[PDB]
């Protein structure tokens, strides 16, 4: 008893394939395709695992300056300040030079651990501020450095030195006034053309303020310049001036952690997600995305394509003939 | 009216309190801010034309009362310093 | 893909297989049947994630990086900033449009090779019994039932009961 | 290339194709004949214009760039400037370098795959007709005219008339 | 009727075949090569389809101000400027700080489209020039700024302002005056030490010049330093200056095109080509070259090889034997 | 690897190769012998240092470069310095991975096309005596002696007069 | 006479496999391994073939400012300078803006070629020391530049001119002094607020220095900084200044060669190697390595991985079974 | 001979409109260009030296006329100015 | 004690070779090295108070002798000038 059979061998197709890319074709479609890309969002901002700082109406540099609208932000370390794309700072605008590093090197610091010191001024009125900076009825500034003007009629100058004998860095962020007429110069301070001197034992760093007019923003027309210094351990800082002074209150405690930086919009949820892009913070199951380029947390990294689908299957064979 | 008698009861205690003599406010004659370029965000400084009866006769006064304002009741408040106080 | 095993000779293939990747398709005296062969399959997938999670670990661990755009333009620092993020875009897409073409082409080749596989071993088990027919399916020259496939779907297939009989209907006599 | 078919069993060439690619040289009874097989090299050049094409829109398309020769040295910022500029110059010539030998791996493997394609197809329409040599040559073993080659070249071959002939030249009966 | 035939498959073969490479060995030969690299040049600038403004002894930044020998830039919009390396500056030499940053600036805006404005300068005479600077007898000078000085025997200051109520960016083109000695810096302006101050409400730039002698070139020996500015749209410019002042008589329109910038000697013809690369404008056909590496437009990139010749075609095999 | 030649069918290397790659095993009627086969891995150890002193000349030429370690952070020129740095090291790394990754399937698959190309040898030199048993290792149907080896370990071997008879044991008669 | 015999095919293993990766794996043995890798370090610098200029309390910016406990390295031409991490610098500590600039283009000299020219300095007494650098008993200074400082109750202007007519470039190592108090800057020159200008054809340079007090190191407080220049064939440099100059006494000849600068700790040793690595220099066999990133000499880049093993060999089979 | 004439009678009438009186040019006695640095490509003041006779009398004069070079045609031409006439 | 006397010496020949005088040396009174904030690694000004018996009489002086130090026998070696030396 013999007969003719057949095993004949094969694969699966489905009628519903999409089309991949190979190095040999240009469009060709298949049995499965997993979208590398992520160009879907949520939109929902969530503050787990990482702790997340958000804004209201309230901007990173203001934050560890304390705008008082601000004043929630005292302490409170995190992993990533979102800042909002509706902000506005009241208080006294300003003009930093190089602005790229200082917001790099703060998002970087990872801690807003403030630390007060006793620092002996001599011959200064601290505490000033201004009337658009504003806590209800009254004044109100900066909630973390001092305003610092003359006293009497006179204005000392001034040598204070901090002996770093712990065994961390030290930031002192201090600034630099920038009036708009002599008149202001003048009546502030003593000085028409006022010096401010930073020294350590490594570098130092001189700088002589600029006098103008300037368009108004929200009343006077003029700026403060922001600088700051480090101090490693076993090292002296010692702050000389002659005029133009904003001496900070306080040292910033360094951190070399991990922590970054985020421009968006979108509002805080709750979750548990890893990785955070701006316009929709999105999971990271896939190697590839077409989300911003603007990226915190172990989730993947910008390629311009759109479809960049993987097979994991094999090629359509679709289902001929009718 | 209230704040300018108040700068100006400040004014003549202050100078009481430096030269060690003893002043009396009467009222205020005249409270003319600044309004060159700009009187507000900072400094707003008080041009008081003050008289007193203290020798028995009337002698005027113009105060330069440097009002800087401070932070808010998180730090210290009433700022207020005599710049210099000519007859 | 290079093999030629997949859309080389095979046109067509089926839409009952939901359970598998390779289906063993057969018609026999007993029925049609539809069996997927696990092994066989197994593997593929076990390749096939080999490189899926390959690259899912292909994610920056960036927790600060420097500016990606800018709402100003100031020239030679800028543009530099702007050439290296743009650089870095290029030589990361064409890495990506190079990493899909090669796993494509990989998988095409793999499911090339698994067919191919597949056939040398459907070969190897019988090499004087499955004479091929070209169309990418196979022929089995002796009488077939149901323990023809749960044998040859498993490891196990003797082929000396059915070695002296697949060779008889290979060959036609004259006269 | 890697599958032995080009350079690994073939010794030569020859200088009459000028129309195509893969020839289909033989020898009969009616003359040596060149007829050039037109359905196997069109793919052949579908796939490798399928690369040429890819790859000749892979121009940089930028209209304003950084500086890229420099008449003075200034230090860091130069260095810099000058180490992106190499280092996307060493990264380019490598991917150049890495995509000349990767398709030139391919091509050869391409041909290499074709030749197999036409190796298989030319068994396969066959399997018992034409017994191979090793010589990247076939052999068939029936009578074989004008026909033949105009059949082979196309797809149509009939392999039942022609089966009863040539399995019995392959036998060499004892006696 | 049987006999013994055969249909001896095989490929082609040419005896004149051509180099390549493969990553398994080091020197093949194939029967075909394309190369992928662009060695040669035609030497010849075409002006299709691209519009390419060519100078005779002009550079771009001397085409901006207005060489008085170039008087034909006036507007004409490019896509590409190419310099000559015959070229001389016969109008009052100058240094611009950041000349990589304003040059690139001004090849991405494209367009040189000018337009005056009514600036209601006060105590200055405008249109001062140089004896350089010459078109035919008597003397010259740029043609798009002022060369501002003093007036009667004083020097009032400067305020100016220009609402931007319109929807596009304005950029202005001004300058610093770096005299020779101190008794050129007294008798244009009558400030030692002159100052100048541009303010918008983001930005500032406050500039103090230098005072020195310096290697003649082409007489005198003072150079004049240019700075700019960008204006955003709803944006108040601000213009202050104590002396010095070289100020500029409108704006320049800004454009977020496709222009470029390049160096080469070759001189104009008539073609239509897409790619100009300098030391020959070249077809592009294939993906790679070895020209140099400066180049504008869609044509490829600089790879230091020589031979890159992809095969299109397969592994030679000469022709054995004899 | 994806032809299957090694760790596909054979499940078993050998201890006793110490002057070669691809050995020669046999049981014979005079006594088990080994011996390496000259040529097959002479081509294998070129074609693996072909791409050896290939890979050899990958050293950075640079005679000058910038900073690579710090001591000290200054911000948006040091990010960018390190942000250089980092994705080059990366691109770097991935592109030594992707040299390994791909080289080790490259010569997996090297090693494992000499493997099908002596098996292809092997079957071509016979292609009636050499029927493959699917294990990865061949089978001969004639009387072999010491003649055997040291004729098919070369390039030369005559397949005329064992032909004849190993044709004779393919087949068993009926009756 | 016909018997059944077998030619069994394979290849070799042995039971002392390494571990390798695959882009379909992620963990397979085979039978050879290179290690790609070069981790391993002998921990010795060898002064052949490239010559090796070694420091032993000597850094490179003082070797050419010529340190006066390091006058040894006059002339001695380089490829490769070693600084030490137990350096000091015993004369006169300073602050060099621009830092990783200048030392970069002086490790790209590759040769301290020094020749004297002959200045017509005007007014001055040069060849001025300091306590802290010392020769032994007495005093001391670097031995390559001039510390200039007032003679009589005056101080001159100063015009030098040096015409390059030579075919090579000219490098000219000057300085600025940076006092602490303002009775420093009133005692050395007699400006309150001293100026420096460098003027050639092309460009120009104008500092104005910095005074304050800073924390001790070794004494004083004060600090200088270092500028330079360099004069193409054909050109003219012009040194103007009304005070604080530390000014050359000679111009260091330019090279366009192959020279670099490394940082590490190991000793010096005889051998003939080529690659030089900071802590170990390792031999170039191989194309990968793990040791530091700082590189001179032909060998290989950094990657971070361990155990990148190429296959010399194929995959392992381990003898199944016992 | 015909500048420094011509420049003289620039001298004399923008002088005479600026006081209100009426001064009568005779000739020019010396016309020292300086050349301290530079006197080309930028201001090219000539020390002119006049005697006019107005009053019935010769009296010297000195005149700084800054004659600050323009821009040609394009722009406006015949640039001249005093900066002081002293007796 | 070697040291203060022979730049007392210094101090009378140079004030003998720039006015064409003739001053005898007699003995150092006070030598008072400044320490207002540094004295070291620059500048070392001697505060050196002399006393001379030349006109018949004792006439006291204060010279500020700049004593910058040289490089060392490299270079010139014997470093000293009189910034002023006042009666
Ligand atoms: C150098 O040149 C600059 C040029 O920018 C001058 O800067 C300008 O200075 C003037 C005053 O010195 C500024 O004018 C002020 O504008 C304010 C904002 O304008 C809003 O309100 C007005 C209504 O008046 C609207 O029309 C306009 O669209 C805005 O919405 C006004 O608030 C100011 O006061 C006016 O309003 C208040 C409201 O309480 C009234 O009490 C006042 O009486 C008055 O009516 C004032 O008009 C101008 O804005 C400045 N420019 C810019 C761009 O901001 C410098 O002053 C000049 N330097 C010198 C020394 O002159
Ligand atoms: C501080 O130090 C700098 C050093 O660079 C001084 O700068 C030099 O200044 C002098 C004059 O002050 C310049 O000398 C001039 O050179 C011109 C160019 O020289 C060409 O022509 C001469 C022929 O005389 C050739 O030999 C030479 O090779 C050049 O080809 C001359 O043109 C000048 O005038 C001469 O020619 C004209 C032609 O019409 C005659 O009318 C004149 O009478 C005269 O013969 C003049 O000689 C010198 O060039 C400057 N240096 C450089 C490098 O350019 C500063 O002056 C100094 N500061 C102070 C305050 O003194
Ligand atoms: C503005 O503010 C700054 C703050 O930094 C001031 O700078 C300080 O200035 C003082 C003196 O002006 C310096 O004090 C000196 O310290 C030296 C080093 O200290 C070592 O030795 C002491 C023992 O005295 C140890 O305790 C210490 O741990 C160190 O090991 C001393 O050497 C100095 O002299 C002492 O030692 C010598 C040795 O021979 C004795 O002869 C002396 O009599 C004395 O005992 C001196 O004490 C201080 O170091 C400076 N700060 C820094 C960070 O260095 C500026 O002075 C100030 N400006 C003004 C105008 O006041
Ligand atoms: C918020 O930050 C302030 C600093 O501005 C903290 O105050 C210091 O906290 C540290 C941490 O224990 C103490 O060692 C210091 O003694 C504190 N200084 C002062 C002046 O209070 C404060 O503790 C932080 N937390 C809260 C809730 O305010
Ligand atoms: C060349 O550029 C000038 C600007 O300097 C052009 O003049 C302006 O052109 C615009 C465009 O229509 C007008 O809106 C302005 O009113 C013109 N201003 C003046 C002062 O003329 C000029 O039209 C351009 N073309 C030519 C041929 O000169
Ligand atoms: C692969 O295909 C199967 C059947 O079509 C499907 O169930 C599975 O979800 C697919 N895998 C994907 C989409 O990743
Ligand atoms: C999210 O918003 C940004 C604007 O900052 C935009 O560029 C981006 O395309 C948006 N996301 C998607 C997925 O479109
Ligand atoms: C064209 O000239 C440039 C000089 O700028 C040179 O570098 C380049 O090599 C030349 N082109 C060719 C093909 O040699
Ligand atoms: C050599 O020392 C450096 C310190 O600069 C260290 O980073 C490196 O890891 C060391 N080398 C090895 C192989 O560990």
């Not at chain 1, 934050?63 to 932000?73: E, Q, S």
């Not at chain 1, 929709?280 to 390629?303: E, H, L, M, R």
């Not at chain 2, 009002?67 to 408040?77: G, N, P, Q, R």
Request: net charge negative; charged share 25%; aromatic share 10%.
């Amino acid at each position: 008893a013999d007969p003719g059979a057949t095993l004949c061998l094969g694969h699966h197709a489905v009628p519903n394939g999409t089309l991949v890319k190979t190095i040999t074709d240009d469009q060709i479609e298949v049995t499965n395709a997993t979208e590398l890309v992520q160009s879907s969002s949520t939109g929902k901002i969530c503050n787990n695992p990482h702790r997340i700082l958000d804004g209201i109406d309230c901007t990173l540099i203001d934050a560890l300056l304390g705008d008082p609208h601000c004043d929630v932000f005292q302490n409170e370390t995190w992993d990533l300040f979102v800042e909002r794309s509706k902000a506005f700072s009241n208080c006294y605008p300003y003009d930093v030079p190089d602005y790229a590093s200082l917001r790099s090197l703060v998002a970087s610091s990872g801690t807003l651990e403030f630390i007060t010191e006793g620092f002996t001024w001599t011959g200064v009125t601290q505490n000033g501020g201004s009337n658009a900076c504003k806590r209800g009825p009254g004044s109100g500034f900066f909630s973390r450095l001092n305003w610092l003007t003359k006293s009497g009629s006179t204005y000392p100058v001034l040598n204070v030195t901090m002996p770093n004998n712990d065994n961390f860095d030290k930031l002192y962020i201090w600034g630099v006034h920038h009036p708009s007429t002599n008149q202001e110069q003048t009546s502030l301070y003593v000085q028409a053309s006022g010096r401010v001197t930073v020294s350590t034992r490594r570098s130092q760093q001189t700088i002589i303020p600029n006098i103008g007019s300037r368009p108004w923003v929200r009343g006077l027309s003029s700026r403060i310049s922001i600088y700051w210094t480090i101090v490693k351990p076993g090292d002296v800082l010692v702050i000389n001036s002659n005029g133009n002074l904003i001496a900070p209150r306080g040292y910033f405690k360094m951190r070399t952690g991990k922590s970054s930086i985020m421009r968006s919009d979108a509002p805080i949820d709750t979750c548990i997600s890893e990785c955070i892009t701006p316009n929709g913070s999105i999971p990271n199951d896939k190697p590839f995305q077409n989300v911003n380029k603007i990226t915190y947390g172990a989730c993947p990294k910008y390629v311009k394509q759109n479809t960049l689908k993987l097979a994991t299957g094999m090629r359509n064979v679709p289902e001929k003939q009718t | 009216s209230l704040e300018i008698e108040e700068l100006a009861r400040f004014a003549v205690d202050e100078h009481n309190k430096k030269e060690n003599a003893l002043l009396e406010f009467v009222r205020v004659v005249k409270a003319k801010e600044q309004f060159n370029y700009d009187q507000w965000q900072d400094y707003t400084m008080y041009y008081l034309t003050l008289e007193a009866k203290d020798g028995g006769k009337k002698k005027l006064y113009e105060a330069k009362v440097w009002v800087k304002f401070v932070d808010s009741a998180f730090e210290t408040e009433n700022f207020k310093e005599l710049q210099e106080f000519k007859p | 893909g290079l093999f030629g095993a997949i859309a080389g000779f095979i046109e067509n293939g089926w839409e009952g297989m939901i359970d598998g990747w390779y289906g063993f398709r057969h018609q026999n005296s007993e029925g049609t049947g539809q069996a997927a062969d696990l092994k066989s399959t197994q593997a593929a997938i076990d390749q096939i994630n080999g490189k899926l999670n390959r690259v899912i670990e292909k994610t920056n661990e960036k927790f600060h990086q420097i500016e990606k755009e800018f709402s100003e333009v100031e020239g030679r620092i800028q543009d530099l900033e702007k050439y290296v993020e743009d650089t870095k875009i290029d030589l990361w897409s064409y890495n990506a449009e190079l990493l899909v073409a090669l796993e494509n082409q990989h998988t095409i080749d793999l499911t090339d090779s698994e067919m191919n596989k597949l056939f040398e071993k459907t070969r190897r088990q019988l090499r004087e019994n499955a004479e091929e027919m070209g169309n990418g399916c196979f022929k089995i020259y002796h009488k077939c039932d149901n323990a023809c496939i749960e044998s040859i779907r498993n490891g196990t297939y003797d082929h000396d009961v059915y070695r002296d009989e697949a060779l008889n209907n290979r060959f036609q006599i004259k006269g």
